[PDB]
Design a protein around this ligand. Structure first.
Ligand SMILES: NCc1ccc(-c2ccccc2)nc1
Ligand SMILES: NCc1ccc(-c2ccccc2)nc1
Lengths: 213, 206
């Protein structure tokens, strides 16, 4: 049973998540994803969420007063606050397994040049906070990273969504455009098949990800 | 100028992409089936759990959408790493086609056949498993498109007004107007954050 709240100035971006959720999981009360427009917590008639950086430089920084009010309303002492950022600790499969048993994730999606650092520093005095990156590239905002995190975590929760690298896979037909399925896979020698698959995995890992060796 | 075509059995998942020099189009793989059931998958040769996407339907789809100049992109956790360097490289391409798998992935002969007539790249966006390639497609599209003409270390912390908030102050050097001192402080904060969170970037363990 997990609740996820996402906060963003582009709530429409998170619509695929709500679409991916099976009715059985929702009906059984196993999962609830809610999306919130950050501008609900703005203070001025222009609904301002950003301002110029102290110390100068290009771009804009998201305002601490707006984010502080949003997180005060949505978070509790039991919340795990997730902040996607290219400057974060790495998000990996082990991270996804750890977070899959949490009761409440709140995901804070930044835009522009990111969020005033005092927002995370203040939140960390009363809840657990995790700044994370999903890979070594810069996006326009945190929304696409939030989609990846939500999918990787929820597929590990029982019944919600419905080392070495993996080697190649095959199915029918046995011959296609001049290429045959490797005959060992049709041999009925299942110890030999497992050894063949292990070697394919070793070779693919050497070629594509030597860091893993 | 870039065209991006995405092929998927869940075209609705690609909706967030709606955010003149670039065009993105989304195609339902089932358009290229021929049976009434529109079957795209079958059990794996050699055993194992799950299902594999059939090569026949994929071959017909890519025949229609791709040319010899196409860069065919296939997201997979078993791929070469997609990084900022990759994004710069792909930013000057005329035509990307992104093939999104589901189930346990796509029959390997699809990529092998395509490679006889165009350039093919199997890539991973990070070390985690998804239920399909669609979310990875969205990450790749965003990282590439922001670099298209006409559109190291970790960055340190940023701040904006007010200078004091909830009893927490913006670092005084940032209010001092001293460009040399500010540059030096920011360089230090970046290198400090990098050794703490990403020691691999500076050539250290873990
Ligand atoms: N994990 C990769 C990642 C995450 C977040 C952002 C991002 C970009 C702009 C503003 C705020 C966050 N970029 C990359
Ligand atoms: N780059 C990470 C990544 C990419 C693709 C997939 C995936 C999952 C299931 C089926 C087909 C592709 N998973 C993770």
């Amino acid at each position: 049973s997990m609740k996820i709240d996402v906060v963003t100035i582009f709530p429409e971006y998170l619509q695929p998540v709500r679409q991916s959720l099976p009715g059985k999981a929702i009906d059984a009360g196993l999962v609830d994803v809610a999306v919130h427009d950050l501008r609900r917590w703005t203070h001025d008639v222009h609904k301002s969420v950003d301002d110029s950086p102290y110390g100068g430089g290009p771009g804009m920084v998201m305002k601490p007063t707006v984010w502080g009010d949003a997180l005060d309303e949505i978070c509790t002492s039991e919340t795990l606050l997730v902040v996607p950022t290219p400057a974060g600790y790495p998000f990996t499969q082990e991270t996804a397994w750890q977070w899959s048993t949490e009761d409440h994730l709140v995901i804070a999606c930044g835009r522009y040049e990111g969020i005033d650092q005092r927002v995370a520093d203040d939140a960390a005095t009363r809840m657990r906070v995790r700044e994370v990156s999903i890979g070594d590239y810069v996006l326009n905002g945190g929304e696409a990273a939030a989609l990846v995190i939500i999918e990787a975590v929820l597929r590990l929760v029982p019944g919600v969504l419905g080392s070495l690298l993996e080697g190649p896979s095959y199915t029918r037909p046995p011959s296609w455009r001049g290429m045959d399925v490797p005959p060992v896979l049709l041999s009925g020698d299942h110890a030999k098949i497992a050894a063949w698959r292990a070697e394919q995995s070793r070779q693919r890992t050497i070629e594509r990800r030597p860091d893993l060796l």
